[PDB]
């Protein structure tokens, strides 16, 4: 019935993208100066996790981050002095995401319990306690990012993202449209769009203002495990299990660059950009992260020293730190 016209509309979209694609990224950057041999060493190491760390997030003060692990502990790391600020006992032993507020007043975490827990960090009593229990999904909460101090956008196991009013504890819009289990999302710097990648090998841009999808990028093969916006908000990179990262454009809609090596087969768990955006650090699954030149697709360096799977990655806002979490219970701050 309508499947044939849907298929020819697919073909029309691909034909429009082919016609609009006139020169690849690597053709114009053929004369750019490469970053060359890069070398980075472990300035700090945050020891104190006793189980499998799955995700972390930085802070906008570029000093305090938060980490989560299988033990059920939410440890706030002072990356300057390598200290512990808080230890929040999670009610769920299974978490694979956490978020840190730009205001710092709130912290979030979620996992196989399908519920996002919110804890208050600047409570008048001086301790940390639950403030709102954001429930309403039907799948595991695989990513969470604070839109601001009163909103969080979350990607869940029920193939739908959801903006959340943190005060009332209810959603305001639902981002249905994934034919596959969504894992990661990333927020635009202007905080009006967010792109989320799912297991159907497609990342979708969404309008945060009303709750509608704008593009879909189907370059990858297996399933999307990571995603991160560019600092200008007009591009993003996707991590996935097909041993390849991909850079996309929100406007040109094509696939700009591919980040793969024929000598590596394992998947990619986390991606984050630097300030300039020339530096994309993809946490691989060969026990280390990989430094990628985001214009030449050249592996500039390697970030080795992890005893287990690399689970999460994040570059701080002022770009002085590469915080790598891992399954071997050791965070490593790099510079």
């Amino acid at each position: 019935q309508l499947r044939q016209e849907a298929e020819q509309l697919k073909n029309q979209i691909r034909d429009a993208r082919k016609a609009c694609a006139d020169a690849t990224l690597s053709q114009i950057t053929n004369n750019i100066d490469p970053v060359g041999r890069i070398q980075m060493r472990t300035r700090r190491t945050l020891r104190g996790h006793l189980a499998k760390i799955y995700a972390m997030h930085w802070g906008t003060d570029s000093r305090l981050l938060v980490s989560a692990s299988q033990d059920g502990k939410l440890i706030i790391w002072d990356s300057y002095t390598t200290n512990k600020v808080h230890a929040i006992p999670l009610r769920s032993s299974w978490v694979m995401t956490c978020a840190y507020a730009p205001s710092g007043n709130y912290v979030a975490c979620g996992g196989l319990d399908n519920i996002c827990s919110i804890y208050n960090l600047k409570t008048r009593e001086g301790n940390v306690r639950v403030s709102r229990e954001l429930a309403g999904h039907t799948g595991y909460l695989s990513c969470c990012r604070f839109l601001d101090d009163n909103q969080i956008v979350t990607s869940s196991g029920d193939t739908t993202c959801a903006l959340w009013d943190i005060e009332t504890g209810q959603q305001t819009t639902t981002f249905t449209g994934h034919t596959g289990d969504v894992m990661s999302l990333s927020l635009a710097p202007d905080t009006r769009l967010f792109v989320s990648g799912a297991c159907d090998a497609s990342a979708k841009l969404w309008d945060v203002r009303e709750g509608m999808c704008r593009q879909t990028f189907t370059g990858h093969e297996s399933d999307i495990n990571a995603i991160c916006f560019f600092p200008n908000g007009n591009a993003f990179a996707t991590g996935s299990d097909d041993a390849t990262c991909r850079l996309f454009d929100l406007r040109a809609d094509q696939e700009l660059m591919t980040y793969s090596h024929d000598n590596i087969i394992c998947g990619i768990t986390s991606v984050s950009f630097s300030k300039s955006g020339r530096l994309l650090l993809a946490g691989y699954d060969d026990f280390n992260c990989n430094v990628w030149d985001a214009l030449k697709a050249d592996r500039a360096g390697v970030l080795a020293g992890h005893d287990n799977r690399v689970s999460c990655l994040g570059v701080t806002d002022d770009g002085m730190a590469v915080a790598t979490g891992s399954w071997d219970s050791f965070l490593k701050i790099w510079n």
Binding site: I13, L25, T29, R214, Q215, N232, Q254, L295, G319, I333
Partner: protein, 55 residues
């Protein structure tokens, strides 16, 4: 029910603007070269102002 929804959603998605990929890639290149002096990991800084002093 989902088939007509995806058809209408992707018909709405199809009729959007697409700027030339040379222009977008040049804008990405310009953003990268215009912030090269600001990125600490691309251009390393001496340990005087570095907040990560090993001990």
């Amino acid at each position: 029910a989902q088939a007509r929804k995806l058809v209408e959603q992707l018909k709405m998605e199809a009729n959007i603007d697409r700027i030339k990929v040379s222009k977008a890639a040049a804008d990405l290149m310009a953003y990268c070269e215009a912030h090269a002096k600001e990125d600490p990991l691309l251009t390393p800084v001496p340990a005087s102002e570095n907040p990560f002093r090993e001990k």
